[PDB]
Amino acid sequence: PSWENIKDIRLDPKVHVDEVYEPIVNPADRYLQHVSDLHQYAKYIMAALPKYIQGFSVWKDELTLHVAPSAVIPVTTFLRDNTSTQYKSIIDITAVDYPSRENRFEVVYNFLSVRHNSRIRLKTYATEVTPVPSITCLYEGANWFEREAYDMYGVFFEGHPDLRRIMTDYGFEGHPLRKDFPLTGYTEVRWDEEKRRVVYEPLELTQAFRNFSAGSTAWEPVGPGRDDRPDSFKLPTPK
Amino acid sequence: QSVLVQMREGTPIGLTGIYQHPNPRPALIALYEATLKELQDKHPKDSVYRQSIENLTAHRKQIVEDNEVSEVIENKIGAGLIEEVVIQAHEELELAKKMSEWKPWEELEEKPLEDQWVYFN
Amino acid sequence: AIIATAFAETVKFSGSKQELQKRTLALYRQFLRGAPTFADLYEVQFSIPTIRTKIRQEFERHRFVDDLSIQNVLYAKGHMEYQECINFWKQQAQFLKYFPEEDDIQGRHQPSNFVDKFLKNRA
Amino acid sequence: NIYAGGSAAAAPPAGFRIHRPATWEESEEGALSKATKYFLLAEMFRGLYVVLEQFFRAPYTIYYPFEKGPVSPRFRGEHALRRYPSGEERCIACKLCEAICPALAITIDAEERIDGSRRTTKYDIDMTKCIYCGYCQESCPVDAIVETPNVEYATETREELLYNKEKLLANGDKWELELQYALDADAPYR
Amino acid sequence: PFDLEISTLLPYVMSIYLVSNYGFTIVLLFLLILIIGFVYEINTNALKINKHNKPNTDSLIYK
Amino acid sequence: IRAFTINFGPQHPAAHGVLRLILELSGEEIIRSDPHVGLLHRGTEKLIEYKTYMQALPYFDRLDYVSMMTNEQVFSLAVEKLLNVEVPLRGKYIRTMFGEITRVLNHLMSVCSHAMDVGALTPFLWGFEEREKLMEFYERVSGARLHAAYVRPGGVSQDLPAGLLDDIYMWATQFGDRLDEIEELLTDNRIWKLRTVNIGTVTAQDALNLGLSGPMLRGSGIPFDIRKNAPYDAYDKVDFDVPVGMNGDCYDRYLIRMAEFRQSLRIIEQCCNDMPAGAVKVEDFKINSPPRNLMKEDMEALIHHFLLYTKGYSVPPGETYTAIEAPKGEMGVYVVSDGSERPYKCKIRAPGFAHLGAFDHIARGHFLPDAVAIIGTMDLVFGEVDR
Amino acid sequence: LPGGPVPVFKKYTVGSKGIWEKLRVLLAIAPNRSTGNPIVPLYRVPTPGSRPEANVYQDPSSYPTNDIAENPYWKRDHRRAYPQTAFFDQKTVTGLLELGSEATPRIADGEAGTKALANIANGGVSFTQALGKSSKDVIYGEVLTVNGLPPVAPTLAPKQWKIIEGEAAIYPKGYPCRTFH
Ligand code: SF4
Numbered sequence A: 001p002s003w004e005n006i007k008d009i010r011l012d013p014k015v016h017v018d019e020v021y022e023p024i025v026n027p028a029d030r031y032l033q034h035v036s037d038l039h040q041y042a043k044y045i046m047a048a049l050p051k052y053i054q055g056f057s058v059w060k061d062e063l064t065l066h067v068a069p070s071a072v073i074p075v076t077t078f079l080r081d082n083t084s085t086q087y088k089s090i091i092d093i094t095a096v097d098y099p100s101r102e103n104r105f106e107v108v109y110n111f112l113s114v115r116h117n118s119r120i121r122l123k124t125y126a127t128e129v130t131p132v133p134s135i136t137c138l139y140e141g142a143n144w145f146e147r148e149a150y151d152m153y154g155v156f157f158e159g160h161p162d163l164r165r166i167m168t169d170y171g172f173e174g175h176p177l178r179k180d181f182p183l184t185g186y187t188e189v190r191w192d193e194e195k196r197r198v199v200y201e202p203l204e205l206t207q208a209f210r211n212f213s214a215g216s217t218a219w220e221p222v223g224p225g226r227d228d229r230p231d232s233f234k235l236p237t238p239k
Numbered sequence B: 001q002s003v004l005v006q007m008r009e010g011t012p013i014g015l016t017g018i019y020q021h022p023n024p025r026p027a028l029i030a031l032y033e034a035t036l037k038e039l040q041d042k043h044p045k046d047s048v049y050r051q052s053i054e055n056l057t058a059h060r061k062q063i064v065e066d067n068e069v070s071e072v073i074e075n076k077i078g079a080g081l082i083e084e085v086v087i088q089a090h091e092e093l094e095l096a097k098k099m100s101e102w103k104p105w106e107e108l109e110e111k112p113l114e115d116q117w118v119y120f121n
Numbered sequence C: 001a002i003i004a005t006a007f008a009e010t011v012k013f014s015g016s017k018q019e020l021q022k023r024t025l026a027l028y029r030q031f032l033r034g035a036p037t038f039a040d041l042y043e044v045q046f047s048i049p050t051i052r053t054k055i056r057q058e059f060e061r062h063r064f065v066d067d068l069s070i071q072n073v074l075y076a077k078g079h080m081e082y083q084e085c086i087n088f089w090k091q092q093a094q095f096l097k098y099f100p101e102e103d104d105i106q107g108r109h110q111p112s113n114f115v116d117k118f119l120k121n122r123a
Numbered sequence D: 001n002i003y004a005g006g007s008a009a010a011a012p013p014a015g016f017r018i019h020r021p022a023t024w025e026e027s028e029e030g031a032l033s034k035a036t037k038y039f040l041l042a043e044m045f046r047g048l049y050v051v052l053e054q055f056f057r058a059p060y061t062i063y064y065p066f067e068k069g070p071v072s073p074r075f076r077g078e079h080a081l082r083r084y085p086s087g088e089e090r091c092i093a094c095k096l097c098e099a100i101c102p103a104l105a106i107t108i109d110a111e112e113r114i115d116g117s118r119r120t121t122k123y124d125i126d127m128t129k130c131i132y133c134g135y136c137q138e139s140c141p142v143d144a145i146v147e148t149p150n151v152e153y154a155t156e157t158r159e160e161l162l163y164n165k166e167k168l169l170a171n172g173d174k175w176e177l178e179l180q181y182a183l184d185a186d187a188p189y190r
Numbered sequence E: 001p002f003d004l005e006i007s008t009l010l011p012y013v014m015s016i017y018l019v020s021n022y023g024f025t026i027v028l029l030f031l032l033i034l035i036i037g038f039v040y041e042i043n044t045n046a047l048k049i050n051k052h053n054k055p056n057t058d059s060l061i062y063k
Numbered sequence F: 001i002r003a004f005t006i007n008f009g010p011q012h013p014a015a016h017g018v019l020r021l022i023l024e025l026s027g028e029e030i031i032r033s034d035p036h037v038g039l040l041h042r043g044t045e046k047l048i049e050y051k052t053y054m055q056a057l058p059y060f061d062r063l064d065y066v067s068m069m070t071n072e073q074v075f076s077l078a079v080e081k082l083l084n085v086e087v088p089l090r091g092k093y094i095r096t097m098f099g100e101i102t103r104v105l106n107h108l109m110s111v112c113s114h115a116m117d118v119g120a121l122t123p124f125l126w127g128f129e130e131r132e133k134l135m136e137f138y139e140r141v142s143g144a145r146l147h148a149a150y151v152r153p154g155g156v157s158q159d160l161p162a163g164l165l166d167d168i169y170m171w172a173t174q175f176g177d178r179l180d181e182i183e184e185l186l187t188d189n190r191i192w193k194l195r196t197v198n199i200g201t202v203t204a205q206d207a208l209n210l211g212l213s214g215p216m217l218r219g220s221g222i223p224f225d226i227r228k229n230a231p232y233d234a235y236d237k238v239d240f241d242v243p244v245g246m247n248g249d250c251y252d253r254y255l256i257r258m259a260e261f262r263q264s265l266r267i268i269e270q271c272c273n274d275m276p277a278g279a280v281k282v283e284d285f286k287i288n289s290p291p292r293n294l295m296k297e298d299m300e301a302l303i304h305h306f307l308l309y310t311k312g313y314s315v316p317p318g319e320t321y322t323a324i325e326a327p328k329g330e331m332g333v334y335v336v337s338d339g340s341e342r343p344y345k346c347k348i349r350a351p352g353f354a355h356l357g358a359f360d361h362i363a364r365g366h367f368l369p370d371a372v373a374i375i376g377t378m379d380l381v382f383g384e385v386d387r
Numbered sequence G: 001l002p003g004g005p006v007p008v009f010k011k012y013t014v015g016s017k018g019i020w021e022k023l024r025v026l027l028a029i030a031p032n033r034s035t036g037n038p039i040v041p042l043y044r045v046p047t048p049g050s051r052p053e054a055n056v057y058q059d060p061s062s063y064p065t066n067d068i069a070e071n072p073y074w075k076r077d078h079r080r081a082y083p084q085t086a087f088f089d090q091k092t093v094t095g096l097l098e099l100g101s102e103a104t105p106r107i108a109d110g111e112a113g114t115k116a117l118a119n120i121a122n123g124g125v126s127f128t129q130a131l132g133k134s135s136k137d138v139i140y141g142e143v144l145t146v147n148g149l150p151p152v153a154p155t156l157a158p159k160q161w162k163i164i165e166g167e168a169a170i171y172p173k174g175y176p177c178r179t180f181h
């Protein structure tokens, strides 16, 4: 009946099992029934708009769509406007380069059907020279996102007010997330005394940067791996 | 005539920015019949798009046409709220008009480069 | 974010070399008109025709590019730097990037021959 | 049943239709009683009474040069190099601490000494960029660098902040007690 | 005027015993002019600084 | 012709953030705004391509520096989904309830910091005090305070102490009094209710068009939460109500944050009663370290202990976007695996990024002191937005 | 109501004395309120540097994992059993239409079935040509549903919603936030 008389917890019997029996399972089975479901949707999408879809792919319930560069707006309307397909909400866009291939950058989109609790991913491609159009005509927040991945890469968004750099130095030249562009950049900053201001002098380090990815196995030691493709949607063998 | 699909000021419902649409069923079914007419006008009968949405909106319109009260019809739909269904049907009405000019039922206009959808294999 | 800022334009890609040339000409007129604003705003040490003879020679750097679309990215970058300088968005430290050569006469022994390169093993 | 299409089991739930909000006349209390709470400021004096109650209770703060807050055994602060019993430097240059310091604060050169065993010639932490990952502790097989839970080592020059081998062995000399105490509570949970 | 009327009312309150039951009547007429002079502005909302952040009252009239 | 447009904050306008923010005021009414972010922009994404996933983990508790543990969690989740591994049961619950005490911490910082930004000084200290009590609970598990070298992409760094699971219950009984106490002078509060009744309305479809999430989207009325829509980490196995607001105002965005304390405490009640036994890391020694007991005894554990700390663990190629419900909002991460041991690329979706991007759609017409109450309930900590 | 107000002798707080307790019961908003200080001989005793439970502590492990005799690694492997990134061309979907499926193939003559495969695998037909070629039962079987409905955008685990409303709610009415779950 008072705080002096309260019991402790530090001395009591606790639960004490000798050895827990945790069963082993591959964490992909719980996806599989849905994943084989998802394919039927995805093929449907290609049957829906065959003019603009180069392909679809999926890997562990992440649906990925394959759109030409001059093809973005007619897909994204349909992804917004259909009752069966209403994603309504940009989540994040960015780019990834692959300088090995001819079309250099590829532009990725993420959406979120808040009605139907689903995600969808839209990949296009663009060389640094050529554009991709802006989805700021429909998705209102996306104009901020498109403002981001401009500066990191140089990949454009045609048809876009307020296209300008962000989250970098204003007088910066080049693009950071670009595999030719070095890590420390070109220019460092110090306060010159005599100009009573800071000046932008080219790079000098005390310690040279040391990566350690030079120690690396050529073949990726992960194996080929099994599939989870549905038995409907892989090719039937002859006979 | 003209139709309204979202009362932007009225008595509130749970979703803010949306208010209670007076007389949802006739506006809803006229908004349907616009879609039903338009896609038959402008889409050639091969396409999955028109054969889907004609079937879909007809199946939706059956539930709308044959049942009266508020809280039963939307559970028969399985989408969200009544005003919300009105807005999304309005939306696909806009969509089919844009598909009339963008012509999705063609073959693909731009092939990918064959060395483009290759990641790491 | 329906609306833009004051001078920002929707980016749009001119189909012809002539329309690009028209836009660049208007753009150089915009820099040249806003140049006395810059010396007030960025409080710079030097005079307005030095700003103007830089803005001329920077376009002289890129007078001889062949492609339409490489001049298109070049025009877009120029328009963004105009967008920065017309507001307070750059600061005068970042504004004085464009004159390294003006503020300090370089220093003793600028290497010219082979030998002055060689005695400091090319700096 | 069968759903429509554009139609999951995510219908609006039971009673999602919110009530029509109450007007002036669909209110249970009198206007005089409501306006008593209006003018006489009921929820103003209520929170005033709250903070008055907190005036008459205990504070929490401690006299920091005289009392110190809680210190876990797995707390981390500045570094030290342990030694063996009968005093041997305990650091071989496995370079794991160089390999996984994600700010590259570690720099080691090391040579085979007179007797032939490997020891570290120069061991150097850049404590400007020691980011207190503590991964450098978890990366030593022979358990040489540790996390001394000192934090009160604030310097006045950047020159003082480059801990070479000598400062770290001096810290391993100094804090040897507490590092024994900490590993007597952590070496199971490592 | 609302600062000024305090200094107008200020010679009244010193002499209020002399003006028994009648300077009451005069000053109460004075106040009852000034109070409706006040409730001019509150019905015209002269200190409303209203915002043009309107939620677009007009609905989706279509087609 | 334009307004006499201002710089909002160079240094200390909104606490915990460098909010350089252009405003164009016409009647002390914002006709338009333009926040320049980039002032904290360290460029972390360029760095994280040059370090192993092993090393790449404390980039992310630097990101969103008031809720470290959800960032830790979301990168561990992205890599566990990418690696096709499964964290064990004990690991699931311990990561879950740390991700909920971090939620308690995040709302405890954010609500009180917003109250200080408005002017209420008393929660700004009453909350940070209980935050110090939670600094202690970060301290016993992992390293020091405020930056936990914790959940690994294999799961959990290490086990608890011997008695934290007890001690946190002694804390959890009194957090309810210490929470209702700060509730008592802000919730009714005609000053606060005046300042926050319809300020910054956010309609439903415009909340979706601005990509917003978390407490803001749930304040607008849409019932969406990753803990219950696309569940994980035994949030299925723990009963948990979710609050959903009514208007689009900042007052629902306040009241939902007040509610999530009451919810995340119930998390701790259903976690501390039912913490199981079992391995706290992942089962194998091929994505995280072996314990230091048996690596001095076994030959096999050394080579794993060495390769994980020189090379690191090798990841199958592919790409994932894993997004979970940070207390700020939906925080996402998009990692693109080379198949090497460095991530070939890794984007973050910081939650406040679109919140800042949706500013001048909401902030039009309002006043300049009203342009402060809008700030700290979209929670611009600015560690998030640039990076 | 299972988590409602509990009295202050079960709250682990420094409390009060007994005439001042009798004072503050009459002077408080609610009596069941903790002053925030934890109890000193209970909270954080013994210190984590000296825990007798920490003396014997080997390892947490599970039985199919730590089993030395029975398992190999490759049965309990998880990194090399990842699913492959299933990629689909425009062309292989035309293969899925006309050539059929491993559920229901449309191809006999396994020698010439390869020839019927391969031109489509080289681009003999087009997709819209296959759509005109596909029958009503084909479209309603492997493109649309059996009622010919478009597939709903599918979800991992659909979470239906309750709305808790009454005295179990976290706010009574008047307060705008509801508490669905
Ligand atoms: S804790 Fe210090 S020594 Fe260890 S990795 Fe970080 S910076 Fe390096």
Ligand code: SF4
Residues within 6 Å of the ligand: D090, D091, D092, D093, D094, D095, D096, D097, D098, D108, D136, D139, D140, D141, D142, D143, D144, D145
């Ligand atoms: S302290 Fe450990 S990691 Fe560092 S050099 Fe010595 S053995 Fe290697």
